[PDB]
Design a protein around this ligand. Structure first.
Ligand SMILES: [Mg+2]
Ligand SMILES: [Zn+2]
Lengths: 49, 1278, 97
DNA sequence: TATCTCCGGGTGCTTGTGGTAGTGCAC
RNA sequence: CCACAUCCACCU
DNA sequence: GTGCACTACCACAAGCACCCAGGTGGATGTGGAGATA
């Protein structure tokens, strides 16, 4: 919000569209790596650096 | 290290609760205001949940507490659920007995009931506290006696009703009155004198025949207690024997302590097998619960909870807001209240025992526990007075439209994402999108940091981050590095309403200057995105695995055709269509001279001279050829286009051009379009043969062209052709100059007199009403018919005028092509918008004579505002209804994934090719669109040869095959096509490749591992928002229509009797006759004496699916459901394939209930496939021929979705409470099959890339493979 | 309406104070307290649904916001989720709405 | 005496209850 | 710190 | 062997819990009486 813009919604309709394709790893990282898994997101940030 | 495979949910024992928690909380003190540190052992204690200072604080996120209640309590879920699980395990009424026992002052008693109170032996009756408190201690009465007055009754006088104990004292019932000086004690007891030692002491309760005292001289006679008074040396025995006394949840516990499941199960079986279905219904209803406890382990003894768990503090934190004030979740308030009440109860029980106060406090504590567990089920506890907002309990956190399930199933927040307004991207290619450079730099920040660390921009990553934190340090080298980073990366663009699969699309970002996102025009229809201010979101996948996924199977260049049907979505849009129509149009003006040209060879010079003068125009309508074709002949298309560039001939001019092999009398515009197609693709012969250069390029022509190019060329060539078409359409629409003025809305003059004629007819009808010849309904129908006929006549006249006089009119040109507008809109602009619907649903009698070319009267505009408001409200609500339907379908169908070896299905469906009833009795060929939607992309069940061509069994039906079959059916060879269908597939969870079909975004057969269920649900639900719909709802959710049509269940003949009270239709057979009563409104469709079959609709109207299934069978009702669902979608012009509807219908009736029991109960319904496996195991695999005779049960979409083996999806779908309760009664080991469960757990999706068929695929290059194979063959010695 | 609600609250308060109070020469202070009525007025002017933020984008915006009529209100009169029957215009709206 | 702390609209479901016909006791 | 409630808008 | 009342079963009425599209931006709001310091 005031500090940073904040993340964009991914809802369920977007999830339904994403898994309607064969994309499974994209959904896996966008539900855990880029959304919630704190150790996962920290490790991913360090690895990308 | 081991992978998660199953998720089990069950009840938790008090031992489990104590094992979870680390200590107990006793103080209701959250946190002191002055000392920000935790106050005491309460809800935030330091040593009970872990260190608050940086193990990290995450331990406090997971450590749980517990509260040891001094009084047992029962979970509100197991007592207030609609099937009361405690109330159905025991023989207690759910609604009133259970709660009056569980809250109020009522007593249930198992052990002793032989005592008599006017009622025979008591076993488990519910009796009020008053009558039990009486029969506990006999029948006691007390009478004070005034001092100084001696009553006439002594200490041992038996007293009956009416006896005067004194000059003013009289009793009321039989008993014994003991006298004192100073009172009278009336007891219902028997007194026995004795003079020897006592055998039974004071306090013991005795049974008849037992020795009381004095040896065998004195013995007990009735149940009761013995009291010995040595003042008169007498033993009194009351008629109240030792009987238990229990109240509250603790009492319930005792019941659950003494209940054994095996004996109850055997008794239920015995008392269910014998009687009729009336009792056996509830018998099996409770027997299933008993078996659920028995087979699942956990006993119901701990079904009520003794120790209440306490959530970790960070899950219910208290946060400073401003100026020291604390914002806290309602969880802390509920926990504080429960702790305070439990402490008060402990203190009260410790100090003293005032029974009524103790009981009130017990009720209060029970209510507090229930309110904590779930708020609203009994009363409405609220926050501090002044804010009437009910407290949020655990159930509110779990359930609701905004609950834990609907915030973790969705991943509501993403790191690498942004959003911005979208603008048109005409210079972009179809596989590209324009990304603003600032948001692109921000989104790719870690990649940019790594890239500039690779070079010498910054020493370390901290320096790079502080360089990029302030925009005044931006440099051209940073932009070059950013461009280098995103050379191969792709980003996912998304529109806020994601109706179907194409709402997410991958693109190759191109750095642009500005704030908006540049979007390719051709994807303006895949998304429902115009450029009137709407915004779109962008996401950046990180892993190379996800990058490959997005670039391969989500790139916009690879998705050109719909998943709902074969119609392309990357078709040329409005402006491109307009430009291509303008360039490929032929104009004709007038013929002024003798058109005869075929015969005279000297006429060429004469007509050339005539064209030199004004005798004949260049595009003259001659007999054989125009003078334009004679005057100009071009050796090559290049010469013709060069002559056009010199202004000699326009692109809309008829002319003879020598093409590669023939002389064509065409226009240079058509030749240029053909050349555009031929250069967009490589070869020119194929391009020439896949176009039709004899007609204007309407939108249907462009769609067919795109489909043919995709079929015969592939992916890249189709995309290049689309790009070329878009570019040239833009250029020629710009140079052609299409403009709309007020004079372009030409009003035909003939329509004028048309109105007059109608007006005259109107007047006639008016006088026809004043003579009494017509009724109000008849007059209204006549007026409506007249106006709706003259409206169509005016539309026809308008279009005829446009064709005849102004072929190049912008409105007419846009209407003919697929650019914009409809004939109704063009009529409203130029003709008249006559009929306007009333808010009541009918139509106004007075039409609107004027149009928008003219000026509407105030009344006409006020009338049209009605329709405007109706449309707005209808959109704003039907969108919500369609969304709910889509969610239902997705959740019910989400488990269908094509995982398969080709199933040995010797079954199929015969798709009809003729409409069975368009007139009362007639057969005609179905429409081409319906046949294509029913046959295209299917697999032939068996070989069929129809027109000298052998269509082999197992061959996918392409579009050409569908056309051939339609032509053959027109010729009259075949009427039904036997094809495979998902409805007959034998796959466990999903459908096989053959039984599914051939239609996809591509044309090739479906790949194994694709989640066809979700795309099917999306395809069905997407048109609903742009749509009737209640009919779709009542078909998908199997219901009983209000206008039910009577159907017959057995073959016979029809006997109609026209009794005025109610028509009687008789189905007459050889051995019996059935009778049906049809009211006056029952407008039937059968004739007397006609043969009638089972399931044939006797009357016209909707057919209830359940009775149809009972009558004909599963296949017939499946076909009826599919056809009825397709009917409404066809009526709205939506082209939707039948594969998705068949998937949903198969998932709708995948349940059967058995009639002849095997190893389970009879009247229970579950999966058809499980019963098939059980039958195969019972009959063949194992010994014992026990036929499990079942019948298929058809249930709605909601019921099918709710009743599933996996409890995670059911809990997350509709109702967490009931589903979780059912999955808690019996330990439900949720196998992680289905996509919703894996989304919940966040693991790899079983569909798509995660399918075990393709999940692991070892990849090695040539040299490593050669080395390891050399190792292999050297292991094979010699 | 909000003022008379506050006045009724003040009337209940003064009745209770008189019931508790013994003597009589206490009219100024020991009878009426400004807290209930002032609190009611402030609540109405701050947290009510019809008392809403002014839209001063331009003079026309402010004027239109000043002359808007709402079917909604406190909540017991009209509510969001189901209002389909009353959303349509009426034949009497001519010249008035 | 001051500050702190207590004082709906629609659908599926279940249940019920008089109605209604099979069956038990009297003509 | 961002919790929740209320209101006004924008895109379907 | 039939006339009469009886009791288990069925259609109808009533009470009740549960549903009610997705996304974004902005704005303002979150205590009064008793009891003890
Ligand atoms: Mg828009
Ligand atoms: Zn199959």
């Amino acid at each position: 919000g005031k500090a940073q813009f904040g993340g964009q919604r991914f809802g369920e309709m977007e999830v339904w569209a994403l898994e309607a394709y064969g994309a499974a790893h994209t959904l896996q990282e966008m539900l855990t790596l880029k959304s919630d898994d704190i150790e996962g997101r920290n490790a991913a940030y360090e690895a990308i650096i | 290290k081991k992978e998660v495979r199953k998720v089990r949910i069950a009840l938790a024992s008090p031992e489990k609760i104590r094992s979870w928690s680390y200590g107990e909380v006793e103080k209701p003190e959250t946190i002191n205001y002055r000392t920000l540190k935790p106050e005491r052992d309460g809800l935030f204690d330091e040593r009970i949940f872990g260190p608050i200072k940086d193990t990290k604080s995450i331990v406090r996120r997971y450590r749980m507490g517990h509260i040891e209640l001094a009084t047992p309590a029962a979970h509100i879920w197991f007592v207030k659920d609609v099937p009361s699980k405690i109330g159905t395990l025991l023989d207690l009424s759910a609604t009133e007995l259970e709660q009056v026992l569980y809250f109020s002052k009522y007593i249930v008693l198992d052990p002793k009931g032989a005592i008599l109170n006017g009622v025979p032996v008591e076993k488990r009756q519910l009796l009020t506290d008053e009558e039990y408190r009486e029969l506990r201690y006999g029948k006691q009465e007390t009478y004070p006696l005034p001092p100084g007055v001696d009553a006439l009754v002594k200490d041992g006088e038996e007293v009956v009703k009416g006896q005067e104990l004194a000059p003013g004292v009289v009793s009321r019932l039989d008993g014994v009155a003991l006298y004192r000086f100073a009172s009278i004690l009336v007891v219902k007891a028997r007194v026995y004198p004795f003079e020897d030692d006592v055998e039974v002491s004071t306090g013991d309760r005795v049974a008849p025949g037992d020795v009381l005292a004095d040896g065998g001289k004195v013995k007990s006679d009735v149940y009761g207690r013995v009291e010995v008074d040595l003042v008169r040396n007498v033993v009194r025995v009351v008629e109240s024997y030792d009987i238990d006394a229990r109240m509250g949840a603790e009492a319930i516990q005792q019941l659950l302590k003494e209940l054994d499941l095996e004996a109850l199960e055997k008794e239920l079986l015995e008392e269910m097998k014998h009687p009729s279905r009336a009792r056996r219904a509830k018998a099996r209803k409770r027997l299933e619960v008993v078996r659920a406890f028995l087979d699942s382990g956990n006993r119901p003894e701990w079904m009520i909870l003794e120790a209440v768990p306490v959530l970790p503090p960070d899950l219910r934190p208290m946060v400073q807001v401003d100026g020291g004030r604390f914002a806290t979740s309602d969880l802390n308030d509920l926990y504080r209240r429960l702790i305070n009440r439990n402490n008060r109860l402990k203190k009260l029980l410790a100090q003293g025992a005032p029974e009524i106060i103790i009981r009130n406090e017990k009720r209060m504590l029970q209510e507090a526990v229930d309110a904590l567990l779930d708020n609203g089920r009994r009363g409405a506890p609220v926050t501090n007075p002044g804010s009437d907002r009910p407290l949020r309990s655990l159930t509110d956190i779990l359930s609701g439209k905004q609950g834990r399930f609907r915030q973790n199933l969705l991943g509501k927040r993403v790191d690498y994402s942004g959003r911005s307004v979208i603008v048109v991207g005409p210079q972009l290619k179809l596989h590209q999108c324009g990304l603003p450079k600032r948001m692109a730099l921000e989104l790719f920040k870690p990649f940019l940091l790594k890239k500039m660390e690779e070079k010498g921009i910054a020493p370390n990553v901290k320096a790079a981050r502080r360089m990029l934190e302030r925009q005044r340090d931006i440099k051209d080298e940073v932009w070059d590095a950013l461009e280098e980073v995103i050379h191969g990366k792709v980003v996912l663009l998304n529109r806020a309403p994601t109706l179907h699969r194409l709402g997410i699309q991958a693109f190759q970002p191109v750095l642009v200057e500005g704030q908006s996102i540049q979007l390719h025009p051709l994807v303006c229809e895949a998304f429902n995105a115009d450029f009137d201010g709407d915004q779109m979101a962008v996401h950046v996948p990180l892993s190379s695995f996800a990058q490959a996924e997005a670039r391969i199977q989500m790139l916009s260049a690879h998705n050109l055709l719909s998943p709902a049907s074969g119609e392309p979505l990357a078709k040329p849009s409005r402006d491109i269509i307009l430009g291509l129509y303008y360039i490929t149009q032929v104009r004709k003006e007038k013929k002024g001279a003798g058109l005869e040209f075929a015969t005279p060879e000297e006429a060429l010079a004469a007509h050339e001279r005539g064209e030199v003068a004004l005798n004949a125009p260049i595009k003259v309508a001659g007999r054989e050829t125009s003078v334009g074709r004679l005057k100009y002949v071009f050796a090559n298309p290049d010469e013709a286009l060069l002559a056009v560039a010199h202004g000699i001939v326009d692109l809309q001019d008829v002319v003879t051009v020598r093409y590669m092999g023939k002389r064509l009398e065409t226009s240079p515009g058509r030749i240029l379009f053909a050349r555009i197609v031929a250069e967009a693709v490589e070869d020119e012969k194929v391009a020439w043969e896949l176009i039709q250069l004899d007609v204007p390029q309407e939108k249907n022509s462009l769609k067919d062209l795109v489909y043919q190019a995709f079929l015969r060329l592939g992916m890249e060539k189709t995309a290049r052709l689309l790009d070329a078409l878009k570019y040239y359409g833009f250029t020629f629409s710009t140079t052609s100059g299409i403009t709309i003025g007020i004079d372009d809305a030409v009003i035909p003059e003939e329509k004028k007199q048309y109105l007059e004629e109608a007006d005259r007819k109107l007047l006639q009808i008016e006088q026809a009403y004043e003579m009494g010849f017509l009724t109000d309904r008849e007059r209204y129908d006549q007026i409506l018919q007249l106006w709706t006929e003259t409206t169509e006549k005016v539309t026809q006249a308008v279009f005829k005028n446009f064709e005849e006089n102004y072929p190049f009119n912008p409105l007419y040109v846009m209407a003919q092509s697929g650019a914009r507008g409809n004939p109704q809109q063009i009529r409203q602009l130029c003709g008249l918008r006559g009929l306007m619907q009333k808010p009541s649903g009918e139509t106004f009698e007075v039409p609107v004579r004027s149009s928008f070319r003219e000026g509407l009267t105030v009344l006409e505009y006020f009338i049209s505002s009605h329709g405007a408001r109706k449309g707005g409200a209808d959109t704003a609500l039907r969108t919500a209804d369609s969304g709910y339907l889509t969610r239902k379908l997705v959740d019910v169908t989400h488990e269908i994934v094509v995982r398969e070896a080709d199933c040995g299905t010797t079954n199929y469906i015969s798709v009809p090719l003729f409409q069975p009833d368009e007139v009362t009795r007639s057969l005609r060929l179905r429409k081409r669109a319906d046949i294509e939607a029913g046959l295209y992309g299917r697999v032939l069940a068996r070989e069929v040869e129809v027109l000298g061509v052998r269509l082999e069994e197992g061959r996918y039906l392409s579009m050409d095959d569908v056309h051939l079959l339609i032509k053959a059916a027109e010729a009259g060879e075949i009427q039904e096509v036997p094809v495979r269908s998902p409805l007959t597939c034998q796959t466990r969870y999903g459908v096989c490749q053959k039984c599914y079909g051939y239609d996809l975004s591509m044309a090739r057969p479906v790949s194994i591992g694709e989640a066809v269920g979700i795309v099917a649900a999306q395809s069905i639900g997407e048109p609903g928002t742009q749509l009737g719909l209640p009919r779709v709802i009542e078909l998908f959710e199997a219901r009983r229509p209000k206008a039910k049509a009577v159907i017959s269940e057995i073959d016979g003949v029809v006997r109609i009797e026209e009794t005025e009270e109610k028509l009687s239709v008789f189905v007459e057979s050889e051995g019996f006759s059935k009778e049906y009563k049809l009211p006056k409104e029952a407008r039937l469709l059968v004739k007397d004496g006609d043969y009638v079959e089972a399931g044939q609709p006797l009357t016209r109207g909707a057919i209830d699916p359940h009775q149809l299934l009972e009558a004909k069978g599963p296949e017939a009702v499946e076909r009826y459901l599919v056809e009825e669902i397709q009917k409404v979608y066809r009526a709205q012009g939506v082209k939707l394939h039948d594969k998705h509807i068949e998937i949903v219908v198969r998932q709708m009736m995948k349940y059967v209930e058995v009639t002849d029991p095997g190893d389970s109960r009879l009247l229970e319904g579950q999966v058809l496939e499980k019963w098939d496996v059980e039958a195969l195991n019972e009959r063949l695999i194992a010994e014992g021929k026990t036929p499990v005779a079942w019948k298929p049960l058809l249930m709605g979409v909601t019921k099918s979705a709710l009743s599933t083996k996996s409890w995670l999806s059911a809990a997350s779908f509709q109702n967490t409470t009931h589903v979780l309760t059912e999955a808690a009664i019996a330990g439900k080991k949720d196998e992680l099959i289905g996509l919703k469960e894996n989304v919940i757990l966040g693991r790899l999706i079983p569909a798509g890339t995660g399918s075990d068929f393709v999940r692991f695929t070892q990849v090695v290059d040539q040299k490593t493979l050669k080395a390891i194979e050399e190792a292999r063959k050297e292991a094979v010695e010699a | 309406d909000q003022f008379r609600v506050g006045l009724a609250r003040l009337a209940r308060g003064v009745r209770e104070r008189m019931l508790m109070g013994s003597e009589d020469s206490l009219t100024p202070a020991k009878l009426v307290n400004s807290r209930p009525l002032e609190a009611a007025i402030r609540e109405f002017f701050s947290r009510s649904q019809l008392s809403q933020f002014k839209d001063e984008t331009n003079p026309l915006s402010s004027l239109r916001h000043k002359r808007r009529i709402s079917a909604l209100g406190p909540g017991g009169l009209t509510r969001e989720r189901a209002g389909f029957d009353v959303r349509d215009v009426h034949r009497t709206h001519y010249g008035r709405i």
